[PDB]
Amino acid sequence: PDSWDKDVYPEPPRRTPAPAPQTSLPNPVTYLTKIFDLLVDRPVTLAREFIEQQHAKNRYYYYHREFRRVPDITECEEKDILCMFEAEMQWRRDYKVDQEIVNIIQERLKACQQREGESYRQNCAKELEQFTQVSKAFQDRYSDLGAHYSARKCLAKQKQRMLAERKAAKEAAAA
């Protein structure tokens, strides 16, 4: 279905074997499938067709909200309450977006685990590395902030991380 973008949630081509009846014995699976179609799928399809044609007579749209970019906490005055407020709200929205990105990656990993069957250890390497990278970046970003997290606390964490990285790089390069 075109409801969701196939690129964001990829699926393999889903190749399936053709039936290969070795004997002439009629299996019950095909008969049960045919009868299930006959007295399940047809009424359901008719009901869905009726509902869809009723929906088509009344067509209206809803819209995704776009948010403008505002100055971050890094260019905010020490006691400017309004700019601090705007930066905090933008940071919260970005945090929610990051959470949903992690959710998407986790969903892809779980789908890979289920689909690949017994060979999941081999055929789900790429998704595992993607999840590892995303999880590491998310942990570096938002982990250990606490219940009363804020843009300023995350900025302080990032500043401390950059200071440690700069000290390590200065020590190693001059060695």
Partner: protein, 70 residues
């Protein structure tokens, strides 16, 4: 229908919060300024506050006093 009938848009709450934050920030800075002004005025005494009374100089009698050396 619920959103249209019972609620408003996010911009209303956003701007109301901004106005409230501005008002409270000005109130806080005014409180700090008032505390500092009170402290300075009481320590020095050169402002209109904490002006304790002194003896009025209009009560002094400026006239010969039966003795030249006052």
């Amino acid at each position: 229908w619920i959103a249209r009938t019972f609620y408003d848009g996010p911009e209303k709450n956003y701007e109301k919060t901004m106005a409230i934050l501005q008002i409270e920030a000005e109130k806080a800075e005014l409180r700090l300024k008032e505390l500092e002004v009170r402290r300075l005025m009481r320590a020095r005494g050169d402002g209109p506050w904490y002006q304790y009374p002194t003896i009025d100089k209009a009560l002094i009698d400026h006239s010969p006093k039966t003795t030249p050396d006052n």
